[PDB]
Nucleic acid binder design. Sequence first.
RNA 1: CGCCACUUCAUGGAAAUAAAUCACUCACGAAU
Lengths: 136, 314, 469
Amino acid sequence: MKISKKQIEYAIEALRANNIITNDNQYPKVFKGYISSFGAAVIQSGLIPAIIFFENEDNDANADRHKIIGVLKDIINAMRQQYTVTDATILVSSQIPANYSMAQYIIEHGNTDQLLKEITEAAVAMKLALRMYKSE
Amino acid sequence: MPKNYTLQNASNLGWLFYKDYYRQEPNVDFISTQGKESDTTADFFRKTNQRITAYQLNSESPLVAAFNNHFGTPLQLKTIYPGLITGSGLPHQTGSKGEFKLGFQFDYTTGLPYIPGSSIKGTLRSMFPFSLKDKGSTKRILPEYRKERMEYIRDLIIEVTNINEISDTEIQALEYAIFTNSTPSGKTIEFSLEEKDVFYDAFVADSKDGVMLSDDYITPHGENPLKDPKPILFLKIRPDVTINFYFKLCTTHLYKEKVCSSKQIEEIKKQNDFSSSDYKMITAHQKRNLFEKILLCIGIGAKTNIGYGQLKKL
Amino acid sequence: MNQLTAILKQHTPMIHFQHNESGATLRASEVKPLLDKFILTKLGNGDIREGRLYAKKNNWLIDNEKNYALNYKLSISLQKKSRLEYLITSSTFPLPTERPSNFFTIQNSPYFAQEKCVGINTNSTIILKKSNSDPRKKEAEFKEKNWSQIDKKGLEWQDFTIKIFSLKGDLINKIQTYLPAFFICHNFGTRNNKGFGSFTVEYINNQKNICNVEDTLKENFAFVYKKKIALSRQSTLDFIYIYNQIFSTIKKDYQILKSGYNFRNEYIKSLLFCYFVSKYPNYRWEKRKMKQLIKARGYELKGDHSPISGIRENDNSWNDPNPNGYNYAYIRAILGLAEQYEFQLETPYQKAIVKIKSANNCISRYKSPLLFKIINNSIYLVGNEINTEILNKPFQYSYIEQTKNKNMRTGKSEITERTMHINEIEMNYKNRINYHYTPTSFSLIDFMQYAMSYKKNGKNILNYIPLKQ
RNA sequence: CGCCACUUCAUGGAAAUAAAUCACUCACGAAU
């Protein structure tokens, strides 16, 4: 599991687009804990429980931790945008619709290993991209 | 099936807790905010919790018998109320009602609740003086920590063994021999295979007439007394459950405030410049008694400051 | 030393939600957090911020910057595992002539939470049945399975042990001095402000403690009142008689303070209502305006007596003078914030439910600021100043009409709700001085001075001795 | 005495740190 520089570029662009990393090139410090906790939750509980926990918006958290799910969605869409025609025969190279619940998407698409590897790689890339920058 | 865990008719408790817990049933809907609070979701999680908490363990279990055959004679202690929590930090949470929101340490292969040997080793080392690392941050609390723990350990050693005086350097050497198998400076002592102190994983051995798992509540009332508290539900090991503590301990020889090997100590004995004043011995039985006293004093697991994880003699 | 061992005595039963286990006792998960606050408060001589600086200096805190937690371990274990199990309800009911030897009943209590456990429901612990004899007595049956599956039980234990361990010797010595006062000043359980969970320290490290509970209560509480409760006891004997009389008295006296007593030729006005009429703003019951507004839509409210409007021997009016209007506020909120009010419409299957929700969604609950302590069969009513945050805050009332469906060919069918029946409500009346808003001035010491000095027919309604006013 | 319930269901911190990072022997031998 090697994180390519293109995945890290996707992570940086997604983190900027979802208003986690401001124009000052700083981020709220709680988001590194959010990303680490999501990484641990995926491997301990599972993809569905972790995404459900991190995707809800009625939480009593300091910051908008539901934005890491949007960052994941953007990274996965960017990765699927560069799937070759040969990949598209085995791999579902279809953009996640957006405005769609990510948990709903994963439930509807079975529980294929493809989504699990994609989300694991995207979470690691998000972690590294956040480590590229500075806490507020 | 529901009770008497066994190897022929059971579901893996860890599997039930982690992978099968949030199984997608035809009509459950804990994705939505409305469905997370619904009675259907609460009933689903109640049924799952009842399945998890319905298993008991017999004393004559082939699983625990195999553990005894592999790791040696267990040290048997009992859990008192409220019980025992381990692995509390493992992520098990979605935001639903009736759900277990704290992690639990389950053996992967057997599914039995267990305390990993690293937890036991750390809990035993915590009451030895030389467990806090000499760091810039820890420098301000290092001296008091060492003083308190060294007095406690000195009293425990005098109580357990027939040693009349033990010095601070002797306590340092003994702790580093037990937990690091090394000199306090970092050097190595040429030890035999049987001269290693091993801390195996503790296991649940007997539930007797009840189940070995139960559900408990912590309700943190906030700093604002006018706002509603949040109930948190978690999984605990029931009171009066036998815990088997497996160790592999050797005899530690101390000559002139340094730790000696067995061949070293025999060679020193045959020397004519040998005195019994500066030779000290603590045997495996005495080490086990000392560990037992430490465990009965501080307990093991999570939330031990508020009574969770306190142990009693069988 | 490093280990502090104490033996605790129980004066009133504790309502435990984990009664199922035979080892169930006082939970250290609520004793240690409260004891940490108590010790820090006494370390700073009445304040908590200087006390934590004292513990910060002495390295007694687990974290020096975040919390109040002190570095010690708490372990509460039962010595002898035999319990006395109590059923605590608010309604009197006949006693079954078939019970386990440890089953006891507290009949008239301030614990209105398991009222469904006595009645017709098949899930009830005691099943009430009309007498096969003259239809006046009622028969009670003990359902053992329903008893086992009850959420909260009243448990009283023989003397048990609280064990405190810390390698910090100086912390233990301070805990020793404050531990007896902590148990005299705090109650534990699910109704602890009403008297459930009274424990006292008897032996500390095998040394008997001589602690004056009256003096201990004086230092820690702003006012302390003691009740001259007759004992009779036959001759000691029944603790159930003593328990039932004490808890019946507490409910009667508290219900005289908040709301009133309406049973016989006897009627006692709410002393809280009486207090607010006698002060300058001259606030009146929010219950007055709800009753007025519900009567406005021609709902026949049950009762032959018009709502009271003042203090005098009788002021039985349905109207509020004429030139101005009576000044209204949420009176009983400062003495315990309820969730809904029922008003018992005329037809004996329908009633009005008014629901309080708080406009800003900022006040969800309010614990009673009054603490009832029962030490050695003596009732002590203590307290401090109320939370000033509750004063002057808005509340939204949802008026709901509820008619209990006339049974079914199954069971009761109370899903026949009704939309919020239309009422002319106020928005910002009298410059936010209305029955929506809690009063802007209240002192508990002033209120309790008025309450225990209040006389009807030359006798104090609440017969209490003013130990500290 | 009769009747009767509603409410709340996780946040914050720690997310790797240090020791060892190649060592010794042979570095051409014999015949031509």
